[PDB]
Amino acid sequence: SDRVAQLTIGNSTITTQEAANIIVGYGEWPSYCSDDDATAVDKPTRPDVSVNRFYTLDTKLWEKSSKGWYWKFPDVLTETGVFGQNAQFHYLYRSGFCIHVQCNASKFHQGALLVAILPEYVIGTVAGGTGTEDSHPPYKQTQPGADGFELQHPYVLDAGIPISQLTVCPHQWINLRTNNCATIIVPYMNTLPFDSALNHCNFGLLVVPISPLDFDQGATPVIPITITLAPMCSEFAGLRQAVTQ
């Protein structure tokens, strides 16, 4: 009664028989915005079930040489579903998330993925190699939406910070000999009650292989990793027309 679990939100239900408990980001469940914390004077929309549900957005293939991937969050879920819509029509957005990364293999396979939540995950460039050029990461890299982006220098999280310390962030590992999925529940985290789901990304989801995937030849070599996230306590205010970016 700790390795098996079921997550049910909206009209979606995730099952898992090898999970390793659930992490609750910074030990705080997602809440709605207080009356004294808010400033936007208009009564917000709380679609509830139409947006607070499990969107299974992407699948990556883990290979004996994969570097790792990340997904910026507020964004990843735009354009997809009713959530996407409310995020485009409204200026202000607010919401916590239930992230469930899954990836299974056999008892004869081995490997270990680090799954973390890095708030305000600002990306940096290699500065033209030498460090004299003041380059900047492109829209395609800082806000990749679904499909995420692949890391080029995971050791420093493409941002000059050691991944060795990335665990001071809500994390969970996917050790194949132990489990087959991670489950983080992040609350809304920003220095503001609401912000634009479009141009600001509250945090990134990191999935990095720290202990390389490996298996004797002959065992199914296609080992996918699938991301499934679900917004929680979604609130929207500041209604205008629909906006893409």
Query: Known binding site: residues?
Result: 58, 147, 216
Return phi, psi of residue 93, to 5°.
Answer: -140, 150
Binding mask 26-45 for other proteins (x = CB under 8 A): xxxx-xxxxx-x--------
Distance in angstroms (rounded) separating the CA atoms of residues 199 and 44:
20
How far apart are CB 68 and other proteins at their closest, in Å? 15
Q: What is the number of other CB atoms lying within 10 angstroms of the CB of residue 78?
A: 21
Structure token pair of residue 3: 């390795």
Applying the rule CB under 8 A, the residues between 154 and 193 that interact with other proteins are 155-157, 159-166, 168-175, 178-179, 182, 184-185, 187, 189, 191-192
Taking the C-alpha atoms of residue 108 and residue 123, their distance in angstroms, rounded to an integer, is 36
Alpha helices in 11-134 (DSSP H): 73-76, 81-89
- Per-residue binding string, other proteins, 98-117, x by CB under 8 A, is x-------------------
Residues 126, 136: Cα–Cα separation, whole Å: 9
Judged by CB under 8 A, which of 137, 146, 150, 215 binds other proteins? 137
Q: Does 127 bind other proteins (CB under 8 A)?
A: yes
List Cβ neighbours of 63 (8 Å cut-off, separation of 6 or more): 213, 223
Closer by beta carbon to other proteins, 192 or else 221: 192
Rounded to whole angstroms, what are the CA distances from 185 to 27, 190, 216?
A: 9, 15, 35
The β-bridge partners of 60 are 225
212 touches other proteins (CB under 8 A): no
Is there binding between residue 241 and other proteins (CB under 8 A)? no
Q: Which residue, 43 or 218, is less far from other proteins as judged by CB?
A: 43
Site string for other proteins, 77-96 (x = CB under 8 A): --------------------
Decide: is 138 part of the binding site for other proteins (CB under 8 A).
Answer: yes
